[PDB]
């Protein structure tokens, strides 16, 4: 269990960074993958190749905590990234590329080290806690569903500028990944 | 099957290939790399998926070729219109100019809209692809299972030249690094 709760922040999704196929709720607290290219203007901030979107918030100092609902989802990537991350084309999620993430992919939980580190989770999470300590260079992930158990911590992170909450809802080739990512209500 | 007498020698068209694809010197094998492969962007190149086309173009006749899929966790294979879109996101369907089958997360499917599940008993290691342009037919055969029929698209509206089509798939799991190979004649 942890004591990051007193550092919780209210995250909203940045529509200008969202892949053109994403459908984001009115309050910008939920996101799902849609079935068509969804009428949005071209900009350099927008992720082009993956169902990714950033939180609107920028962090250059302090301790921040937020929670993400992943109930019923078969794939997702979650964490935090540099504002400077590549938006266009193909790229790997790694600290070198400015991403500190974990994911669910094909029934396996992984930390986004390079190469990936498989995580042994006894209770599949329905909700994920994400903690960032900017000055310390720490990004931690917690299994809210299972006693706030620790999933993984990145340490000695090179943030090298502002950080952004990071989300990938994932594609849905099997039909089993339609569920949204939701930011849990504080 | 009885399509062996229509076999053609297929080679891969480098200019069409996703930029992370590693294509052998003989242009008969392809696998997913972990970085860009120092190729320049062009209008032909698939941008969003690890796809590549055969260099050959067909507007008539009967053609057959074979692809090795040994070990691979995921792939898409078949034939497509030369006019298919190369950029952005799209589904593989006849409406979009693709006649394909795939292996995705332990299920074999045909690329209809919506997808049609296949009835494969023996997991293939090699797939034979037959196209009869005039007949409007694309058929898939399980070479591993004595050439048994997998799937036939008929009443195909080819609507112009066709290209062999390949997708090696991404390798997020670490378990899909295997190449696609064009089997020797």
Curated annotation (Swiss-Prot), chain B:
E3 ubiquitin-protein ligase whose activity is dependent on E2 enzymes, UBE2D1, UBE2D2, UBE2E1 and UBE2E2. Forms a ubiquitin ligase complex in cooperation with the E2 UBE2D2 that is used not only for the ubiquitination of USP4 and IKBKB but also for its self-ubiquitination. Component of cullin-RING-based SCF (SKP1-CUL1-F-box protein) E3 ubiquitin-protein ligase complexes such as SCF(SKP2)-like complexes. A TRIM21-containing SCF(SKP2)-like complex is shown to mediate ubiquitination of CDKN1B ('Thr-187' phosphorylated-form), thereby promoting its degradation by the proteasome. The coiled-coil is necessary for the cytoplasmic localization. The RING-type zinc finger is necessary for ubiquitination and for the IRF3-driven interferon beta promoter activity. Interacts with SKP2 and CUL1 in a RING finger-independent manner. The RING-type zinc finger is necessary for ubiquitination of NMI. Belongs to the TRIM/RBCC family. Homotrimer. Component of a SCF(SKP2)-like complex containing CUL1, SKP1, TRIM21 and SKP2. Interacts with CALR, CUL1, FBXW11, HSPA5, IKBKB, IRF3, SKP1 and VCP. Interacts with SKP2; the interaction with SKP2 does not depend on an intact F-box domain. Interacts (via N-terminus and C-terminus) with DCP2 (via N-terminus and C-terminus). Interacts (via C-terminus) with IRF8 (via C-terminus). Interacts with ULK1, BECN1 and with ATG8 family members, including GABARAP, GABARAPL1, GABARAPL2 and MAP1LC3C/LC3C. Interacts with TRIM21 and SQSTM1/sequestosome 1. Interacts with IRF3. Autoubiquitinated; does not lead to its proteasomal degradation. Deubiquitinated by USP4; leading to its stabilization. Autoubiquitinated. It is found in: Cytoplasm; Cytoplasmic vesicle, Autophagosome; Nucleus; Cytoplasm, P-body. Residues 8-185 form the B30.2/SPRY domain. Induction: Up-regulated by IFN. This is E3 ubiquitin-protein ligase TRIM21. The chain holds residues 291 to 468 of 470 of the full protein.
